Amino acid sequence: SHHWGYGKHNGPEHWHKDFPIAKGERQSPVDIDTHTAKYDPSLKPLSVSYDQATSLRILNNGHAFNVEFDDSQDKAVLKGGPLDGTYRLIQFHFHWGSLDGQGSEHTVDKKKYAAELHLVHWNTKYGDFGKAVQQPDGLAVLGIFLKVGSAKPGLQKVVDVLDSIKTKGKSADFTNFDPRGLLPESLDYWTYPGSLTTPPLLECVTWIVLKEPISVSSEQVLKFRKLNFNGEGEPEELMVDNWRPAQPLKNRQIKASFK
Amino acid sequence: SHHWGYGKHNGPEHWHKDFPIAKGERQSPVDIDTHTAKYDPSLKPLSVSYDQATSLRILNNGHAFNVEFDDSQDKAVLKGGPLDGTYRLIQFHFHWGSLDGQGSEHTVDKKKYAAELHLVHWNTKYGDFGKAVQQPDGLAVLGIFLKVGSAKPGLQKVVDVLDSIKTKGKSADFTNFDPRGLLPESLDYWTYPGSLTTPPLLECVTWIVLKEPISVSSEQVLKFRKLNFNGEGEPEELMVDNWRPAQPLKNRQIKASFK
Ligand SMILES: [Zn+2]
Ligand SMILES: [Zn+2]
Ligand SMILES: [Zn+2]
Ligand SMILES: [Zn+2]
Ligand SMILES: [Zn+2]
Ligand SMILES: [Zn+2]
Ligand SMILES: [Zn+2]
Ligand SMILES: [Zn+2]
Ligand SMILES: [Zn+2]
Ligand SMILES: [Zn+2]
Ligand SMILES: [Zn+2]
Ligand SMILES: [Zn+2]
Ligand SMILES: [Zn+2]
Ligand SMILES: [Zn+2]
Ligand SMILES: [Zn+2]
Ligand SMILES: [Zn+2]
Ligand SMILES: [Zn+2]
Ligand SMILES: [Zn+2]
Ligand SMILES: [Zn+2]
After folding, report:
1. Which three-class secondary structure state does DSSP give residue B38?
2. Residue A143 is inside which H or E element, if any?
């Protein structure tokens, strides 16, 4: 009851109590039905420029873990696609499950994936992250599905450091990470106007969800599930099933960048 | 810069940036000038009923440390004085300095004390703490000055447990504490309508500041100054000088319960 989370008492089901936007017109995530999400030839190609991405630190905030980036220049930026502007990378994080058969927030024809990677960018138009989240086109989030298969070499440096931030509030220096190690072979995508998938659930996100999932080993996802929602000294609550289920699409169109 | 505190960058001096109420009509603390704070015979005597006070836990929130109480019944209550209602004890905490010559928030004829004890109560009229802080008579805070002299036996159990919550976010079970061990010989007091002395600086507090200070040993206050503002693993910032200086009294009267 204390403040929001993913348990029986404080979960997605109950977020409408302190956040009436939870039942709003533009909520995320959604289910991407491939028969309705039609192709849009007006969509320009997406330009992911991460070659100068400068990571700083990894931390556990009690809700997931974030790798944070220097956002002071156009070092890691997101351009074109459905975006009018330059969007700087500020952090990324994951949502995952207690079983391989669940963990993703978005779904494709009702299929759930073992996890989902969210790379979070803010529109430089507004000046900083804080001002951007108060505008409907302030954020662009790039969402990537994880399936249990073979190991992702780009993910291993993250996994190695997870013991050092087991409990809420812990953090660590995490430099020279290259977020390109987490991208799939193709950048074909769906896009729709949405929201943050956690409180305050603000409807300020242009979603870009990649068609092609990345593969991670079962050994690597097991490492995610040893994390803790709780602080050190408090009772153990395993950080698992930290995902919001799909929401009503309502009067929105999911445009597709592909065939 | 990150979020508020007591350093050069984030201190009381700069709180007006995110909190315009900091320059409001009813801000606390104030200096109690004894020549103007006249006696009011209409003030009923103060009734401090702490015999059934049930403490639960002690924690470091990064700004000070709080001992928290069961507020579910009328076990520890504050009545009469300038209060119209029953006020339940929810927590207490301290503000102290880096030197014995400072640490208090309130002052008496410009004199500063080594520390100050704040016992925090909410009006049962409103139902819970959260609803109370949004009303001008929602909170009653009982403020007590500490001077460096001989040891306070009632304070020693708090001091013993301080090693176990050195850094921000740590907490511990803290049961069978009796807050009566921190009261002075006399309950003669000054009262005025004010605010929280930390953000969000809400103007919802009826202040009751006791005339008579309590004595604590230098050994006991040294133990306060080993605490840390920071979390575990972060760079060391000693939790000292965590006090707001005196504010303009403006169109307010400080009533005195005594001679
Ligand atoms: Zn339920
Ligand atoms: Zn409901
Ligand atoms: Zn379909
Ligand atoms: Zn590149
Ligand atoms: Zn939280
Ligand atoms: Zn996310
Ligand atoms: Zn470092
Ligand atoms: Zn290939
Ligand atoms: Zn393609
Ligand atoms: Zn530790
Ligand atoms: Zn200054
Ligand atoms: Zn200023
Ligand atoms: Zn005077
Ligand atoms: Zn009593
Ligand atoms: Zn804080
Ligand atoms: Zn205080
Ligand atoms: Zn316990
Ligand atoms: Zn005596
Ligand atoms: Zn008296």
Report:
1. coil
2. strand A139-148
Query: Chain A: residue nearest B234 by CA?
Result: A171
Distances (CA, A) of B173 to A51, A233, A234: 49, 11, 11
Q: Which amino acid is at A222?
A: L
Structure tokens at A205: 């996100």
**Residue partners of B83: CB distance under 8 A and separation at least 6:** B123, B140, B206
Written as one letter, the residue type at A235 is P
How does DSSP assign B88-136, residue by residue? EEEEEEEEE-SSTT---SSEETTB--SEEEEEEEEEGGGSSHHHHTTST
Angle at A105 between CA A102 and CA A107, to 5 degrees: 80
Which chain B residues have a beta carbon less than 8 Å from that of A171?
233-234
Q: Give the Cα separation of A144 and A158 in Å (integer).
A: 16
SS percent in chain A: helix, strand, coil, step 5: 15, 30, 55
Instruction: Give the span between the Cα atoms of A177 and A160, in whole angstroms.
Output: 12
Distance CA B36, CA B171 (A): 42
Pairing of strands B77-80, B87-96: antiparallel
Q: How far apart are CA A71 and CA A127, in angstroms?
A: 11
Q: How many Å lie between the alpha carbon of A163 and the closest alpha carbon of chain B?
A: 14
Give the pair of three-digit tokens for residue A24.
């709003």
Q: What was the elucidation method? A: X-ray
Nearest-CA distance from B209 to chain A in Å? 32
Which is nearest to B153 in space by CA: B214, B103, B100, B99? B214
Would you call B206 exposed, middle or buried from its count of C-beta atoms within 10 A (0-12, 13-18, 19+)?
Answer: buried
Residues followed by a break in chain B, C–N over 2.5 Å? none
Q: Torsion-angle region of residue B220: left (phi > 0), alpha (psi -120 to 50) or beta?
A: alpha
Query: Ion ligand 1 — residues with CB under 5 Å?
Result: A 13
Distance from the Cα of residue B98 to its chain's centroid: 18
The CA distance from B5 to B7, in Å, is 6
φ/ψ region of A241 (left if φ > 0, alpha if ψ in -120 to 50, else beta) reads left
Q: How many angstroms separate the CA atoms of A95 and A115, rounded?
A: 6
Stretch (H or E) spanning A132: helix A129-132
DSSP 3-state assignment of A130? Answer: helix
**Nearest ligand by distance to the CA of A186:** 9
Domain parsing of chain A, residue ranges: 3-259
Q: Does domain A3-259 have CATH number 3.40.50.620?
A: no
Question: Which amino acid does the sequence have at B157?
Answer: K
Give just the sign of the alpha carbon dihedral A181, A186, A187, A190: negative
Helix, strand, coil share of chain B (percent; to 5):
15, 30, 55
**Secondary structure string (H, E, C) spanning A183-244:** CCCCCCEEEEEECCCCCCCCCCEEEEEECCCEEECHHHHHHHCCCECCCCCCCCCECCCCCC
